[PDB]
Design a binder for this molecule. Structure first.
Ligand SMILES: COc1c(Cl)cccc1Nc1c(-c2ccncc2OCC(C)(C)OC)[nH]c2c1C(=O)NCC2
Length: 310
């Protein structure tokens, strides 16, 4: 009948014996993440990987939903699923992002982050979000904590546990009850549980505010049950001190009540790319012009996953 295109994505199932040097990397609401070495047999390659797990049939169902979404994405600024491992519990395997999430990175390196890096990150995140929109994918959980740092010059979008695939001709996603990041959601999402690419645009604006404040908590101290009425009165996140009106105006446009009046991700790319050409004209950072950002036996055959294809 009618519908979409066949999702001919490949789901790689990896043997447990192909993973070495598994060390814990962090745990939390996302589950627990390990780091390790994926060594495909017959291939003189060692690939640094991260391994994620939430053994309930509930958890296995949700982790497979995320695998489906990630196996269908291929973009330099979106985390790529290398495969799944079918052991006691189902694990996801992805490229190792050695610098962690961007929220922790900007907090740790506040005094060595310049306008060039900040505006470049805004370009890359908008490029990934625009790609997800091209695949008719609403992320529904865009935040600085869900952006990972491959290198200081290269970031990728992660965590697709809330992501939904909009059908053709379908414009919105009507969610149900469940814990949702209220301080990153558009008002129509908080009020009516409606999510679109334009509601992701709202979350993009909050994510940019996170970076421009070097990792400040949005509405710090406000209970989540108050965010709805505060947004309805017209209140928004304040202008960060390093932000010119040019950059802050872009954030304010992401928080418009009219979802169609918010900028498109393809437009966020264009605007931030212009500003990244003259970064000190749009971000005012103390000492910006004087800032720098960056095993052994494995080294010989270590290859990053971005250079390991099929
Ligand atoms: C969804 O993609 C993945 C797949 Cl398939 C498989 C494994 C991990 C991810 N992604 C995530 C990493 C991560 C990914 C890659 N390398 C390093 C990382 O960091 C670990 C840590 C704990 C320091 O977090 C900053 N971290 C997080 C996620 C995530 O999903 N939600 C929030 C925390």
């Amino acid at each position: 009948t009618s519908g979409e295109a066949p999702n001919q994505a490949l789901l790689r199932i990896l043997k447990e014996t192909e993973f070495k040097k598994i060390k814990v990397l962090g745990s939390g609401a996302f589950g627990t993440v390990y780091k390790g070495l994926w060594i495909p047999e017959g291939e003189k390659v060692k690939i640094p990987v991260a391994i994620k797990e939430l053994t309930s049939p509930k958890a296995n169902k949700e982790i497979l939903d995320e695998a489906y979404v990630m196996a269908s994405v291929d973009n330099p600024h979106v985390c790529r699923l290398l495969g799944i491992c079918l052991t006691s519990t189902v694990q996801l395997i992805t490229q190792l992002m050695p610098f962690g999430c961007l929220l922790d990175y900007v907090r740790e390196h506040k005094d060595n982050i310049g306008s060039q890096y900040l505006l470049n990150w805004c370009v890359q995140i908008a490029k990934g979000m625009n790609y997800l929109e091209d695949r008719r994918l609403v992320h529904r959980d865009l935040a600085a904590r869900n952006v990972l740092v491959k290198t200081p010059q290269h970031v990728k979008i992660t965590d697709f546990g809330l992501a939904k695939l909009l059908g053709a001709e379908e414009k919105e996603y009507h969610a149900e009850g469940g814990k949702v990041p209220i301080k990153w959601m558009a008002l129509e999402s908080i009020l009516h549980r409606i999510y679109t690419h334009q509601s992701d645009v709202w979350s993009y604006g909050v994510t940019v505010w996170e970076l421009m404040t070097f990792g400040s908590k949005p509405y710090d101290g406000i209970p989540a049950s108050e965010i709805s009425s505060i947004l309805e009165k017209g209140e928004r996140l304040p202008q960060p001190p390093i932000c010119t009106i040019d950059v802050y105006m872009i954030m304010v446009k992401c928080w418009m009540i009219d979802a169609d009046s918010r900028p498109k991700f393809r437009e966020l790319i264009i605007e931030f790319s212009k500003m990244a050409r003259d970064p000190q004209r749009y971000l005012v950072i103390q000492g910006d012009e004087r800032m720098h950002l960056p095993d052994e036996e494995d080294m010989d055959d270590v290859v990053d996953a971005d250079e390991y294809l099929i």
